[PDB]
């Protein structure tokens, strides 16, 4: 009862290779070195999935910092002001609302300089 | 209990442990697997790497060269092949107790009854080879997919049953599961059932 190993070989390959497109050189072409590639690919996706919420939780902090700096206080002193204000923490992402209206941000600033004070 | 009658519909009530037998798939699902296994030629093709037509001639002269670590062209991994667990004659026949055997044909019996599809009609024997008489015999009683199972001897009946592949030659003494199960209407004489009791239970 000879089994010909389906077409199950270059069919389960056929997935990978189509999800493995867009890649410079043999990195996509070759099945060996597009599988040890696909591994590493996924691994990174899963890696960076959490690094999203790191690199943004740097990007945000950064820019809240610049904003407040120009106005009054430092980052440290700021954030501990949305805190000292209570439900109005406003997240860190949505602490920044200064992109299309600086004065929207600036209200929190001034309000927070008095909460600190 | 109800196996119908020729001109009526009635019970015959020759058992109630063969026709009051309660049903569990599990037993039947073993027996039926046996009838299938035990009609199955075990006598297979292939050949082993000992039974290769090759020889031990060695395609390298040890290390010194690095074409292959294999010492043989009687390898099973070769173009010639060999196959490590090559097919041959193997047994595929199971025991199955005589009380499972009967056991099946009693639950299966007493399942057709609960699914009213077992028909006792008599004198369905045919006068002459000519299957247009064995057509009308089923047809007029609005039957098809039959077994035409009786212990009784009519040879014109065995012969004529061979044409049309929705019916085959069946006998009371020859009885098995798989044949009941597939060929849904089940056709038997008053005499047939009486004998079917002693043969089975």
């Amino acid at each position: 009862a000879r089994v010909k190993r389906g077409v199950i070989a270059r069919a389960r390959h056929k997935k990978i290779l189509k999800q493995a497109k867009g890649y410079y050189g043999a990195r996509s072409r070759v099945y060996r070195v597009a599988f040890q590639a696909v591994i590493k690919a996924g691994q990174y996706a899963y890696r960076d999935r959490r690094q999203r919420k790191r690199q943004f939780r740097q990007l945000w902090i950064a820019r809240i910092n610049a904003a407040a700096r120009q106005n009054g206080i430092s980052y440290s002193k700021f954030i501990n002001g949305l805190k000292k204000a209570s439900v109005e923490i406003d997240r860190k992402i949505l602490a920044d609302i200064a992109v299309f209206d600086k004065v929207a941000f600036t209200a929190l600033v001034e309000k927070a300089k008095a909460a600190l004070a | 209990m109800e196996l119908v009658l020729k001109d009526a519909q009635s019970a015959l009530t020759v058992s109630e442990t063969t026709f009051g037998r309660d049903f569990n798939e599990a037993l039947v699902h073993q027996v039926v697997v046996a009838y299938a296994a035990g009609a199955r030629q075990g006598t297979r093709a292939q050949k082993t790497r000992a039974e290769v037509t090759g020889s031990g001639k060695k395609p390298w002269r040890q290390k010194g060269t690095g074409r292959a670590r294999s010492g043989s062209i009687k390898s099973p991994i070769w173009r010639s092949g060999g196959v490590t667990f090559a097919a041959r004659p193997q047994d595929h026949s199971q025991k199955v107790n005589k009380k499972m055997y009967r056991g099946a044909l009693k639950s299966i019996l007493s399942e057709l009854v609960r699914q009213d599809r077992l028909i006792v009609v008599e004198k369905f024997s045919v006068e002459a080879p000519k299957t247009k008489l064995l057509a009308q015999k089923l047809k007029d009683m609005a039957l098809e997919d039959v077994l035409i199972i009786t212990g009784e001897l009519d040879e014109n009946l065995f012969l004529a049953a061979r044409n049309l592949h929705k019916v085959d030659v069946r006998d009371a003494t020859g009885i098995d599961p798989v044949s009941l199960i597939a060929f849904d209407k089940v056709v038997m004489t008053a005499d047939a059932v009486k004998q079917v009791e002693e043969m089975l239970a």
Partner: protein
């Protein structure tokens, strides 16, 4: 019922497929570890073999001795003298009761159940409570 046939709650449970599948947990040497006579091939580790030590049974002495007289002296039950029919019971009658074979020569009647049948333990050796179950009840004893 060629389609309703089936294992009851996983009654015929499927076997392993060792030698395959990484992510199965059955891949490459997947249940015999790495290396050694535990792995590899050579019939596995030999029977009787327990290290390059000697067996524990080759550090115990033997003692057996088979009389083959005990081999022919069987042990039938008292209430299995109920299972031949008739009052007249002998050794060559209890062949027929499938319990005494041709190479069986002697036998003890051992206690176990009440006979109920009235019996003659002619031709058979007999125990003290077996004979006194047939002096509790109907019976005859003189062998």
């Amino acid at each position: 019922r060629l389609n309703t046939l089936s294992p009851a709650e996983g009654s015929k449970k499927a076997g392993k497929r060792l030698g395959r599948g990484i992510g199965s947990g059955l891949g490459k040497t997947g249940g015999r570890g790495h290396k050694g006579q535990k792995s590899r091939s050579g019939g596995g580790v030999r029977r009787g073999f327990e290290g390059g030590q000697m067996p524990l049974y080759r550090r115990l002495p033997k003692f057996g001795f088979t009389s083959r007289k005990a081999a022919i002296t069987a042990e039938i039950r008292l209430s299995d003298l109920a299972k031949v029919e008739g009052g007249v019971v002998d050794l060559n009658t209890l062949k027929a009761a499938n319990i005494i074979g041709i190479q069986i020569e002697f036998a003890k009647v051992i206690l176990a159940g009440e006979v109920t049948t009235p019996v003659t333990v002619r031709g058979l050796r007999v125990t003290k409570g077996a004979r006194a179950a047939i002096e509790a009840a109907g019976g005859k004893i003189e062998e």
